[PDB]
């Protein structure tokens with residue numbers, strides 16, 4: 001019973017989380033997942049400030065109200081070459097990655113690794129945080145509060 005959470009650098013407290021190496025998070029799961037990192041789904045304003053500090057990914061993820069990809073450099077296979085916070089307009093499907101916002105993180109680029117899941121609750125799942133540099137942190141617990149996400 002294992003969940004892998006790949007996480008990024010934080011930029012003005014905003015970071016990206018990919019679960020089990022594929023688009024697999026619902027909107028309800030995303031809010032609960034960010035809560036386990038003492039975080040919330042970013043507002044569009046929080047995500048735009050993160051973008052301005054150096055944040056970009058090539059993956060769709062939830063923010064408050066939309067599913068987006070922050071882009072700095074145009075890349076044909078990432079948000080169809082767009083720059084800025086690209087907003088997903090048309091999709092048949094409901095599962096993506098998520099972004100999270102932690103107000104206590106540094107104001108600009110923080111590319112240190114994540115070494116905790118501070119607000120997970122008791123549960124049976126081995127949850128592993130995987131950093132981009134491969135370093136890992138694991139803990140037994142649960143973060144999903146909605147049965148349909150389990």
Ligand SMILES: CC(C)N(C)S(=O)(=O)N1CCNC(=O)C1
Nearest residue numbers: 037038102105114115116117118
């Ligand atoms: C921004 C996230 C990824 N964190 C660095 S953390 O979840 O590990 N954590 C550290 C302790 N207290 C917190 O609010 C957050």
